[PDB]
Amino acid sequence: PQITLWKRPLVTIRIGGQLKEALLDTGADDTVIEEMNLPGKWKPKMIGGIGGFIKVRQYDQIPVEIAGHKAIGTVLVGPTPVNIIGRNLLTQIGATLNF
Amino acid sequence: PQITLWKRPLVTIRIGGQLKEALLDTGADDTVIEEMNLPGKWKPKMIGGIGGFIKVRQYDQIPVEIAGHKAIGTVLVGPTPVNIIGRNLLTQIGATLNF
Ligand SMILES: CCC(=O)N[C@H](C(=O)N[C@@H](Cc1ccc(O)cc1)[C@H](O)CN[C@H]1Cc2ccc(cc2)OCCCNC(=O)[C@H]([C@@H](C)CC)NC1=O)C(C)C
């Protein structure tokens, strides 16, 4: 899909067998998902953004379906205002910026 | 051009007669430039991201050239670790996400 940026690039994703809305964020190194139960072990981690640093749970090798496209990587779960798909998963689905 | 997301999508922009490196951010509603003495009237405002909110100065109709592409719009100036080109300006240069 070719997505324009007139509106926030929000798409539906499936993670942990559940559907969620997520922002395709090219300015994000990592993928940060709102607090939820994800099967598997997790390690505590700190990531920074605008405003500062927050504490997140780091889940590795998690399968995530982005608009029907598969990706398996690291997902950080924490207190985020919106579900964010970062470059770590965007590169897996072959996402590019064009202009 | 086509920009892959293997590394952060950093490009050269021209603002206030200066050349800066900025991040193409589809997850940003606004454009945020690192602290600089831009002339003109401004309006105080608060923008939020991952770790919280930061106070910034809102400058309207600021000319900003992005990778040789001309644009003009609202620019926020404040304590940011990196220059962020948001959707407000990305749409003007015809930028899209493709996968
Ligand atoms: C440092 C590693 C890194 O890349 N961190 C990421 C990050 O915050 N990236 C921001 C840019 C940045 C890069 C390197 C660095 O060292 C510090 C900051 C990027 O700007 C985040 N993109 C969005 C995400 C978001 C979207 C909506 C939100 C909150 C967050 O609430 C809606 C409210 C509206 N907020 C926004 O539109 C902001 C603008 C203002 C940021 C400039 N957007 C972002 O922060 C997080 C998301 C893993």
UniProtKB/Swiss-Prot annotation, chains A, B:
Locate the active site: D25
Give residue ranges for domain Peptidase A2. 20-89
Residue ranges for the region (Dimerization of protease) are 1-5, 49-55, 88-99
**What highest taxon heads this organism's lineage?**
Viruses
Q: What function is annotated for this protein?
A: Aspartyl protease that mediates proteolytic cleavages of Gag and Gag-Pol polyproteins during or shortly after the release of the virion from the plasma membrane. Cleavages take place as an ordered, step-wise cascade to yield mature proteins. This process is called maturation. Displays maximal activity during the budding process just prior to particle release from the cell. Also cleaves Nef and Vif, probably concomitantly with viral structural proteins on maturation of virus particles. Hydrolyzes host EIF4GI and PABP1 in order to shut off the capped cellular mRNA translation.
Oligomeric and partner information: Homodimer, whose active site consists of two apposed aspartic acid residues.
Q: What is this protein called?
A: Protease
Query: Covered residues of the complete protein?
Result: 491 to 589 of 1437
